[PDB]
Specification:
The structure is a homodimer. By secondary structure, chain A is low in regular secondary structure. Chain A has four domains: about 40 residues, Wheat Germ Agglutinin (Isolectin 2), domain 1; about 45 residues, Endochitinase-like (Wheat Germ Agglutinin (Isolectin 2), domain 1, 2-Layer Sandwich); about 45 residues, Wheat Germ Agglutinin (Isolectin 2), domain 1 (2-Layer Sandwich), CATH 3.30.60.10; about 45 residues, Wheat Germ Agglutinin (Isolectin 2), domain 1 (2-Layer Sandwich), CATH 3.30.60. In chain A, a hairpin with a 5-residue loop joins strand 5 and strand 6. The longest helix of chain A is centred in the first third of the chain and has 4 residues. The interface between A and B is large, with 74 and 73 residues. Chains A, B: This is Agglutinin isolectin 3. Chains A, B: Keywords: Chitin-binding, Disulfide bond, Glycoprotein, Lectin, Pyrrolidone carboxylic acid, Repeat.
Chain lengths: ~170, ~170
């Protein structure tokens, strides 16, 4: 129930700001100076201007490299987040991965829901529990997700811990 | 560190799924059954179909009342989240409030960033910090935000507790 660095990357609900001390609220003491995520008064930098840093809380990254929502951010020139333009991925886009663990459809576009994560999903958080490892032809997961001992892809201690076969295995 | 019920509605970074037990990760153990938020494999219900409920993690709510991203969610029929169509608010939309604490610009659209939260911001997370309470004509905050004893609007103990003049106080 702590956010930001104090809460392991955790984000507040409904865009509430995470203060510099790692708590959630709204007002000058949270969204003001040292705001870590949420609706920070000084918008976070992103995109090419911030070395490819993503926006927290699924915010759109404008082309000036600033995080937010609305036409200025999600519209023309949007570099990441729920951009109003469709975002290509997968074989159709040279094996590109969707950002923010979004699922790449079979048709080559980024989204979340059964239409993207279901049948034919190419990468990201696909619902298809595709088996990996020594039991499944040696195949490794997408998105450097850990292939667990029992041959399923994921992230977390169960996948990346003891018996992790490939992926972002803990060392 | 904990997410969901266990971390008071807290959300995981990069659409990781909050498992039924309050931990963040990816894979059937987090995204499957009991997933509280994030890229859940069975998408949350939202909108008119689900009692006016919003999507976690700023996901769009489709016309059919399910949460996600991509054209089918954020495009036509979107009833919530960062829809591709501009959402109206303020004196133009009969004093409506933007969803998920977004700022209603003075031009009557919902967004986040200086264009929306700066001068003219009507409601939501405005950076302007207009004083409220006894000090400030008796002006009350927008969004049932707590007006603190020092005449600032916000959400959290310093705002909503002792000497909270108006808004969702605790006293």
């Amino acid at each position: 129930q702590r956010c930001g660095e104090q809460g392991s990357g955790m984000e507040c609900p409904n865009n509430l700001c995470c203060s510099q001390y790692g708590y959630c609220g709204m007002g000058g003491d949270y969204c003001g100076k040292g705001c870590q995520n949420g609706a920070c008064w000084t918008s976070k930098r992103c995109g090419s201007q911030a070395g490819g840093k993503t926006c927290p809380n699924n915010h759109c990254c404008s082309q000036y490299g600033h995080c937010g929502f609305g036409a200025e951010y999600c519209g023309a020139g949007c570099q990441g987040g729920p951009c109003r333009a469709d975002i290509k991925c997968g074989s159709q886009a040279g094996g590109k991965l969707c950002p923010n663990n979004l699922c790449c459809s079979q048709w080559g576009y980024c989204g979340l829901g059964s239409e993207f994560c279901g049948e034919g999903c190419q990468n990201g958080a696909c619902s298809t529990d595709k088996p990996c490892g020594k039991d499944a032809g040696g195949r490794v997961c997408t998105n450097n997700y850990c292939c667990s001992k029992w041959g399923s892809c994921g992230i977390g201690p169960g996948y990346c811990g003891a018996g992790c076969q490939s992926g972002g295995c803990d060392g």
